[PDB]
């Protein structure tokens, strides 16, 4: 399925080239511009654990998730991966724990040492 495909066929987007964050573009977005550090970014997402359980979805809440890019407000895989996206793009990201919640995990649903799969849509980005 999609997690296996990104694991085996995804592109390493890390600057370290350590395969910690792998990406596949699923829906090509608009234009060429990617968001800037500090921009307000608006995303829809769904996350799954490696055991197949869905742990989060903004679609289910009927509102996007909003954060300032490149500020550590989200897991490192999201700062790195959203910075590569175009407006309107949908991608899959596979996130090793070193780019996610590490040995701590995150209650209630994310265990220690968890590799995470996301589908992310970049809805919009705005500076000031």
The one catalytic residue in 99, 117, 118, 125 is 118
CB 112 → Na ion: shortest distance, Å? Answer: 29
Catalytic residue status for 56:
yes
Any idea what the Cα angle at residue 34 is, between residues 4 and 11, rounded to 5°?
25
Q: Which of 125, 96, 122 minimizes the C-alpha distance to 26?
A: 122
Residue count at the site for Cl ion (CB under 5 A)?
Answer: 2
The Cα 32–Cα 68 span in angstroms is 20
What part of residues 2-41 is at the interface with Cl ion (CB under 5 A)?
2
CB 128 → Na ion: shortest distance, Å? Answer: 23
The Cα 32–Cα 125 span in angstroms is 13
Residue of the chain from 1, 3, 4, 5 that contacts Na ion (CB under 5 A)? 5
| Closest CB to Cl ion among residues 106, 115 | 115
The Cα 74–Cα 5 span in angstroms is 24
The Cα 42–Cα 105 span in angstroms is 24
Binding mask 79-98 for Na ion (x = CB under 5 A): -------x------------
Does residue 80 have a cis peptide bond before it, meaning omega lies within 30 degrees of 0?
Answer: no
Catalytic residue status for 75:
yes
- Please choose which of Na ion, Cl ion, none residue 1 contacts, taking the beta carbon within 5 to 8 angstroms, the exact cut-off set by kind: Cl ion
| Closest CB to Cl ion among residues 2, 28 | 2
The first and second tokens of residue 116, run together, are 């995470």
**Which residues of this chain interact with Na ion, rule CB under 5 A?**
5, 86
């Amino acid at each position: 399925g999609a997690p296996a495909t990104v694991t085996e066929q995804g592109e390493d987007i890390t600057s370290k080239k350590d395969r910690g964050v792998l990406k596949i573009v699923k829906r090509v977005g608009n234009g060429e511009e990617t968001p800037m550090i500090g921009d307000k970014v608006y995303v829809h997402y769904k996350g799954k654990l490696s055991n197949g359980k869905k742990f989060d979805s903004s679609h289910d809440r009927n509102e996007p998730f909003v954060f300032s890019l490149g500020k550590g407000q989200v897991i490192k895989a999201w700062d790195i991966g959203v910075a590569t996206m175009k407006k309107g793009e949908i991608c899959h990201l596979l996130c090793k724990p070193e780019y996610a919640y590490g040995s701590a995990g995150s209650l209630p649903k994310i265990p220690s040492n968890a590799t995470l799969f996301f589908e992310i849509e970049l809805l919009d980005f705005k500076g000031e």
